Design a protein around this ligand. Structure first.
Ligand SMILES: *[C@@H]1O[C@H](CO[C@@H]2O[C@@H](C)[C@@H](O)[C@@H](O)[C@@H]2O)[C@@H](O[C@@H]2O[C@H](CO)[C@@H](O[C@@H]3O[C@H](CO[C@H]4O[C@H](CO)[C@@H](O)[C@H](O)[C@@H]4O)[C@@H](O)[C@H](O[C@H]4O[C@H](CO)[C@@H](O)[C@H](O)[C@@H]4O)[C@@H]3O)[C@H](O)[C@H]2NC(C)=O)[C@H](O)[C@H]1NC(C)=O
Ligand SMILES: *[C@@H]1O[C@H](CO)[C@@H](O[C@@H]2O[C@H](CO)[C@@H](O[C@@H]3O[C@H](CO)[C@@H](O)[C@H](O[C@H]4O[C@H](CO)[C@@H](O)[C@H](O)[C@@H]4O[C@H]4O[C@H](CO)[C@@H](O)[C@H](O)[C@@H]4O)[C@@H]3O)[C@H](O)[C@H]2NC(C)=O)[C@H](O)[C@H]1NC(C)=O
Ligand code: C8P
Ligand code: PLM
Ligand code: NAG
Lengths: 268, 99
């Protein structure tokens, strides 16, 4: 499975100041950024244009360029119309994209948050407020739903452009998406033994404290933390009574290793 | 509502004294997105810090990764200090020397 998500974050400080920035991820790899400071959308991979031609990329870019300006004017008009009922500062986030599953199946989504809380999605052929959203959003959403050209464009982008473009990305970016990078591991520290595993890709990994062939139950897996070179970091910890650390080992299984696990012995 | 940043500090390679490495400061779970992050060597701001683009998670909270080259040794401390509207004072997290 691979999820493609286009993430926009817009900040409106007051009448005269706002900014919009976006990033785009395929799975856990970044493919684009679009800075407010930038007139155009920047590539973060050699394959960020997927299989689109220079000309079809420009037209897709053109559409976003018009949308970014339209979006900013629309929110600034909405706040004037509502004023002073809805004060600045305002934060709007949008997450949109599609999940590519087994076979050639896919599902798309477009969710919108306001001040950090999910309020609106696009679903089927229309914009909707989600239950619990403030009721002042109903009227602006009704108005946006009257805009048939926007609705048709959004349905196209969600139902068609997205999975098409991501199929081109998955082909074009194959060598990066299927890359294998090997973890290195190291130990540190009743007390708490820590096994640190860093530099692996892709994300799935198995890390466990072992005595011999027996997995130690009290093993706690930490959160997955990113490195800055598109690899992952994880700690597994085990609280052990003082003395009883001899005979313990950290074991790491990962796709990149073959079936040559890393085994690191405490006190070794 | 504001959400307070969490800060995790950890090294790219096993920290071995005298060996050049990379120190990461991962800052997560915060809102709103305006934030200032510094990395500190002996309590002083480290000049060349690189930052990822800000992004956000499924729950809508923001995150960002800062990183800097560093050489651990047993006479230097390292930290990550964050200033955010959610806190009255900057919050500083020291590298625990192991991570
Ligand atoms: C794009 O795909 C849309 C479906 O995909 C979902 O939403 C998109 C945005 C992505 O996020 C995707 O991954 C999602 O899974 C698709 O939307 C569908 O469009 C058709 C019409 O174009 C809708 O049909 C109308 O349905 C209603 C009934 O709707 C209600 O009940 C159904 C279940 O029975 C629910 O699914 C709905 O949510 C509602 O609860 C009918 O009343 C209506 O019939 C009347 O009108 C037609 C004329 O159009 C007449 O011929 C009929 O006889 C009636 O007069 C329609 O049948 C469908 O509901 C909608 N799906 C959803 C979930 O809303 C969209 O059309 C695609 N656009 C393009 C360009 O491809
Ligand atoms: C995110 O990106 C958006 C989209 O680009 C940015 O939006 C644009 O922002 C610019 C600059 O703020 C704005 O241009 C201004 O229009 C003003 C009126 O609306 C003009 O009056 C103003 O001109 C002055 O500043 C220019 C330098 O930028 C000077 O070249 C010019 O000579 C003028 O300078 C006089 O007046 C200024 C004060 O404006 C003063 O400080 C000087 O001393 C001098 O006296 C600008 O041209 C665009 O219209 C916006 N474009 C849009 C909205 O499509 C947005 O600002 C970005 N956000 C952030 C935070 O970076
Ligand atoms: C204060 C809290 C508010 C909560 C936020 C509400 C959710 C708002 C979502 C609004 C999105 C669209 C904004 C812009 C639109 O309103 C239109 O102005 C604008 C221009 O419309 C004119 O030109 C078009 C030509 O293409 C059509 O002909 C249309 O009929 C005509 O009216 N329409 C368009 O630009 C259509 C394309 C819209 C794409 C939306 C992409 C969203 C996204 C981006 C990045 C990451 C994730 C998601
Ligand atoms: C419906 C809005 C987003 C969904 C777009 C479907 C994918 C088309 C491929 C676009 C690649 C980069 C677009 C990013 C533009 C932006 O962030 O505003
Ligand atoms: C709006 O907020 C900006 C950015 O926070 C701030 O610098 C300024 O006070 C405001 N700008 C204007 C033109 O009032």
């Amino acid at each position: 499975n691979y999820t493609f998500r286009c993430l926009q974050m817009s900040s409106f400080a007051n009448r005269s100041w706002s900014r919009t920035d976006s990033v785009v991820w395929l799975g856990d790899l970044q493919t684009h950024r679009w800075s407010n400071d930038s007139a155009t959308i920047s590539f973060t991979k050699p394959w960020s244009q997927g299989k689109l031609s220079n000309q079809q990329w420009e037209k897709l870019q053109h559409m976003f360029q018009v949308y970014r300006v339209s979006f900013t004017r629309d929110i600034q008009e909405l706040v004037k119309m509502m004023s002073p009922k809805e004060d600045y500062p305002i934060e709007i986030q949008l997450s949109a994209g599609c999940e590519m599953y087994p076979g050639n199946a896919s599902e798309s989504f477009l969710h919108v948050a306001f001040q950090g809380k999910y309020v609106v999605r696009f679903w089927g052929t229309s914009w909707q407020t989600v239950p619990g959203a403030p009721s002042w959003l109903d009227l602006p959403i009704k108005v946006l739903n009257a805009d048939q050209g926007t609705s048709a464009t959004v349905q196209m982008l969600l139902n068609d452009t997205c999975p098409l473009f991501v199929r081109g990305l998955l082909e074009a970016g194959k060598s990066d998406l299927e890359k294998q990078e090997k973890p290195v591991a190291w130990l540190s520290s009743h007390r708490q033994l820590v096994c640190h595993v860093s530099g692996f890709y892709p994300k799935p990994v198995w890390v466990m404290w072992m005595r011999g062939d027996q997995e130690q139950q009290g093993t706690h897996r930490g959160d997955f933390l990113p490195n800055a070179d598109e690899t992952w970091y994880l700690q597994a910890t085990l609280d052990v009574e003082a003395g009883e650390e001899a005979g313990l080992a950290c074991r790491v299984k990962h796709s990149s290793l073959g079936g040559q696990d890393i085994i690191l012995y405490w006190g070794s | 509502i504001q959400k307070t940043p969490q800060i995790q500090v950890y090294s790219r390679h096993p920290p071995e004294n005298g060996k050049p490495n990379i120190l990461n400061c991962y800052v997560t779970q915060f809102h709103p997105p305006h934030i200032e992050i510094q990395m500190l060597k002996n309590g002083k701001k480290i000049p060349k810090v690189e930052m990822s683009d800000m992004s956000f998670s499924k729950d809508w909270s923001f995150y960002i990764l800062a990183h800097t080259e560093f050489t651990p040794t047993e006479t230097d401390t390292y930290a990550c200090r964050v200033k955010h509207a959610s806190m009255a004072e900057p919050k500083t997290v020291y590298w625990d020397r192991d991570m």
